[PDB]
Amino acid sequence: EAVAFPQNRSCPYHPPTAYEPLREERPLSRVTLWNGRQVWFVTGHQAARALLGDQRLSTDSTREDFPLPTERSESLRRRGALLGWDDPEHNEQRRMLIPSFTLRRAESMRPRIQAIVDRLLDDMIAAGPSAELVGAFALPVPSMVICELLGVPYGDHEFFEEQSRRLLRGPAAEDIEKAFRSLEGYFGELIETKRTDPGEGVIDDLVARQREEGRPDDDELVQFATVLLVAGHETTANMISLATYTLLEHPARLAELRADPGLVPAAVEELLRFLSIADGLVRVAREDVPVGDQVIRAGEGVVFPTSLINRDDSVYEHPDTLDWSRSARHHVAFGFGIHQCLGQNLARIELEIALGTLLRRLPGLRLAAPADRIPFKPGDTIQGMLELPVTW
């Protein structure tokens, strides 16, 4: 009768079935972790937005009291740049990157994103009448965009796409570490190069702050480049793959987007909301935080089940249904407040161009395998498809 967290989805595009009873307990419920530790489970949309702006919640997975949802994550110590930091140190870091992630900067990259998407679909269409869309499209689009974002030179695009793929797919754990060391090593060299080279992108922008205000040291700069890739790659890739699967499993919603390409921006917001692939943001209370007449005591864990929060029926009528006309505004698929996704302006435009161009170019797109033989991620990680066999 106590509900374990995290759990696997049964259906790639719905929250795990066991959480259903807890949806009625707003704004706070509770779940049990692998070791019997109980944590708060924020089911209320308004409560979730208020808590995610609260400086008394911490992302510091270095603390002995930080809830590690799995036994496997028990090995989490170094603090990860931006997300693994509290303010003021977190804001100091974010302030240096924010100017690279304006909506104007997002908008300026449309033609570069269009060219990446067009090149990958041209290659996929030329290669044959079927594809594994995760490897052929969903995985390389976001890593190639992050190339353009960071200012990786064209000649290095292949190496970068490959090493970023090993990072996610790494046949062996040794491939994941070699890829990581290879990219950190590579970012090191590219910073020296960009000292004695021109360059547009986040890396040149941070070489500029460095000179102009001593600001990012070279090790910090490498950490920023690494987290940007890691935060930007699988999230975007999994939205492309699971959005596609989901669209193919809802023929009448897919037909409305084919009919009216103008709906695609609204559709991307509704898919972010409905899919909520960044499921289960984790905090610990540093101090007592009240919510109504309930108190989250110092040292107690707080889990934000993105997928349920984005299906709060006091905000979204018929929340478990895909609807292109119902405002998906104020969704928390990119989080909210202190740690709200830095790359969300860019992510939205990648999704709009990737899905918009796929639909335009491949009107016959359909699953090339039965939908229940297609593997998807377990409950303890970013949700999404591991493969997506398609034909057209």
Ligand X SMILES: COc1ccc(Cc2nccc3cc(OC)c(OC)cc23)cc1OC
* Residue list, annotated binding site for heme b: 90, 94, 283, 339, 341
Work out whether 343 is an interface residue with ligand HEM (CB under 6 A): yes
CB of 293 to ligand X, least distance (A): 29
CA distances from 225 to 187, 220, 249, 381 (A): 7, 9, 36, 22
In DSSP terms, 149 is beta-bridged to none
382 lies in the site for ligand X, by CB under 6 A: yes
Query: Can you name the residues that pair with 72 across neighbouring β-strands?
Result: none
The pair of structure tokens assigned to 159 is 């190496």
**What does 279 interact with, of ligand HEM, ligand X, none (CB < 5 to 8 A by kind)?**
ligand X
Amino acid symbol at 293: D
Around Cβ 171, how many Cβ atoms within 10 Å? 8
Q: What is the SS3 assignment for 382?
A: coil
- Residue-wise DSSP of 186-226: HHHHHHHHHHSS---SHHHHHHHHHHHHS-S-HHHHHHHHH
* 48 contributes a contact to ligand X by CB under 6 A: no
Among 9, 80, 250, 367, interactor with ligand X by CB under 6 A? 80
**β-strand partners of 366:** 391
Residue 230: contacted member of ligand X, ligand HEM, none (CB under 5 to 8 Å, by partner type): ligand X
Binding site residues, as ranges? 90, 94, 283, 339, 341
- Residues numbered 254 to 293 that lie near ligand HEM (CB under 6 A) are 277-278, 281
- Out of 51, 136, 141, 239, the only residue in the binding site for ligand HEM (CB under 6 A) is 239
- Kindly state the smallest distance separating residue 96's Cβ from ligand HEM, in Å: 11
**Near ligand X by CB under 6 A: residue from 59, 93, 235, 236:** 235
How deeply is 153 buried, as exposed, middle or buried, from its count of CB atoms within 10 A (0-12, 13-18, 19+)? middle
Q: Does 143 bind ligand X (CB under 6 A)?
A: no
**Nearest by Cα to 349 from 149, 168, 96:** 149
Using CB under 6 A, list all residues that contact ligand X: 80-83, 227, 230-231, 235, 278-280, 381-382
Using CB under 6 A, list all residues that contact ligand HEM: 82-83, 94, 227-228, 231-232, 235-236, 239, 277-278, 281, 333-335, 339, 341-343, 346-347
